[PDB]
Structure 1
Amino acid sequence: QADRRTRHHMMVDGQINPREWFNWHPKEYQPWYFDRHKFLYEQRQYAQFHHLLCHQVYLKDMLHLMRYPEPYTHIIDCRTSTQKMHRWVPHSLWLPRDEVEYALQLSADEFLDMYGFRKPDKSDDVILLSHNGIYSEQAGWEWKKQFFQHVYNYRGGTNELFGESYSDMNVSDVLSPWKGPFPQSGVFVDKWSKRKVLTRTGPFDRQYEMQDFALPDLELE
């Protein structure tokens, strides 16, 4: 807390030296729409995985499968922390997220030995849950990595079913303000390009765009 100054060496250009060395150029980056309100994997940095997003099953589908279950629509819990689970979703099986990339590599007999329930067939419907729908989304990506044709995700599984207020506790790794990053300590590039990459135009909380080239606008004046 208390507004720690950060140990990065970014700086705005002064009022004395000319603007030079335009084979790198920082400018302010402003996109069209806000993405911070959206789901975490519906944001801007995950757009390329947009076709990898699992189809959504909703609350009413989950209540209908609670009341009237199907033999091959497998409800699977993807929550990892055993200290944060307090209730049982009906007709659910426990396959925690951090083991999924190993779990689908097993045979059916090894799946039965290492989890106590049968391995789902690749044509069976699989429905995944988590606290917010984040561990279930990564698990759905791991389930779609293998050739599983029908994989669905209930976004906000436990927190809407049981009414809890929990989270999957995703870190989203951001450097500590004592950790000095790469381009300050290094002779990987020449001194002009090193000074021109480390400069920015404005405060260092917003996003910027780095230009690899620039030509002078001779047609203005």
Structure 2
Amino acid sequence: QADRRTRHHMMVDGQINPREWFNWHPKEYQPWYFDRHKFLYEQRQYAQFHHLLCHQVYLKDMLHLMRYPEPYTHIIDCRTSTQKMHRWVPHSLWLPRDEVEYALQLSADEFLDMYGFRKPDKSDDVILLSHNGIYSEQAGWEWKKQFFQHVYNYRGGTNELFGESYSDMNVSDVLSPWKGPFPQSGVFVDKWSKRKVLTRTGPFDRQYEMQDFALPDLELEKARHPEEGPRQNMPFGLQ
């Protein structure tokens, strides 16, 4: 008939019941879109870095610049480990990501002495390069914070160029299932009624929704559920 999942309860098992429409900060109803199929750093979890992103440069631009170089466009290789880099992107130069913060604070001379090539002026085009396009992005943020006017990241960079599959960092799309209780750092007291209410941090987070969302192929999606259908634990009207 009814039970803790179906009934109205302010609290279930000593913690705020996430099932109540009125236990959430109304801001959580505001409309949003799915990120996950977009480039890693455009996603919403990285929002603190969003002001910093870099204008892109596509594969076409890259081949064009291979055959037809510009004098004051610099292509800068950000690949960090020498163990993983076996080829040379034409007309590129090597500033590994790990050094960037230091490198960009050298004088023209000192920079010349440490990296063996001229430090790009702040007007010049700077194209950044990495395996996946992740380290190149982070490096980009560095170059942008010293204020460099044209900084382009080429995502998919060395992997697309050379057909290698390598990665700058090992990060995986899957989030580890949330462990503890709901964090008191996300609990949001209301200012008018002084009423405690959930936010979408923690075990409730949009990442988890997108992660477990229906697959985009009917066959793989039907494989995921029992014969009779997708949600049979629920009463018909909650399905």
CA offsets, 1:165-206, max 9 Å, x none?
A: 111114489999999799699999999999989999997686
CA shift, 1:47, in A, is 3.8
**Preserved CA contact (<8 Å) 1:7 1:178:** no
- Summarize the Cα distance change of 1:212–1:219 in structure 2 as closer, same or farther, 3 Å threshold: closer
**Preserved CA contact (<8 Å) 2:132 2:158:** yes
CA shift, 1:156, in A, is 0.6
**Preserved CA contact (<8 Å) 1:73 1:124:** yes
CA shift, 1:14, in A, is 7.0
CA shift, 1:146, in A, is 0.7
- Summarize the Cα distance change of 1:12–1:174 in structure 2 as closer, same or farther, 3 Å threshold: farther
SS at the partner of 2:196?
helix
SS at the partner of 1:219?
helix
Once superposed, what is the RMSD of the aligned Cα atoms? 10.5
| TM-score using structure 2 length | 0.63
User: 5-14 vs 201-210, which deviates more?
Assistant: 5-14
Distance 1:99 1:135 in 2: 12
User: 63-72 vs 10-19, which deviates more?
Assistant: 10-19
- Summarize the Cα distance change of 1:202–1:188 in structure 2 as closer, same or farther, 3 Å threshold: closer
CA shift, 1:81, in A, is 1.2
CA shift, 1:56, in A, is 0.9
1:93 equivalent in structure 2: 93
CA shift, 1:34, in A, is 1.5
User: 155-164 vs 13-22, which deviates more?
Assistant: 13-22
Distance 2:156 2:39 in 1: 10
Distance 2:44 2:110 in 1: 39
**Preserved CA contact (<8 Å) 1:12 1:202:** no
**Preserved CA contact (<8 Å) 1:104 1:143:** yes
- Summarize the Cα distance change of 1:5–1:184 in structure 2 as closer, same or farther, 3 Å threshold: farther
> Using CA pairs below 8 Å that are at least 6 residues apart, which structure has the higher relative contact order?
1
2:144 equivalent in structure 1: 144
- Summarize the Cα distance change of 1:199–1:110 in structure 2 as closer, same or farther, 3 Å threshold: closer
2:45 equivalent in structure 1: 45
**Preserved CA contact (<8 Å) 1:23 1:212:** no
> Percent of aligned pairs with the same residue?
100
| TM-score using structure 1 length | 0.68
Structure 1: gaps of 5 or more residues: none
Structure 2: gaps of 5 or more residues: 221-238
**Preserved CA contact (<8 Å) 1:28 1:208:** no
Distance 1:129 1:79 in 2: 7
Aligned length: 221
User: 156-165 vs 174-183, which deviates more?
Assistant: 174-183
Distance 2:218 2:83 in 1: 66
Distance 2:153 2:2 in 1: 40
Distance 2:123 2:88 in 1: 26
Distance 1:6 1:33 in 2: 28
- Summarize the Cα distance change of 1:212–1:133 in structure 2 as closer, same or farther, 3 Å threshold: closer
User: 2-11 vs 60-69, which deviates more?
Assistant: 2-11
- Summarize the Cα distance change of 1:174–1:12 in structure 2 as closer, same or farther, 3 Å threshold: farther
Distance 1:217 1:157 in 2: 29
CA shift, 1:49, in A, is 3.8
CA offsets, 1:3-25, max 9 Å, x none?
A: 99999999953799999999998
Which is richer in helix? 2
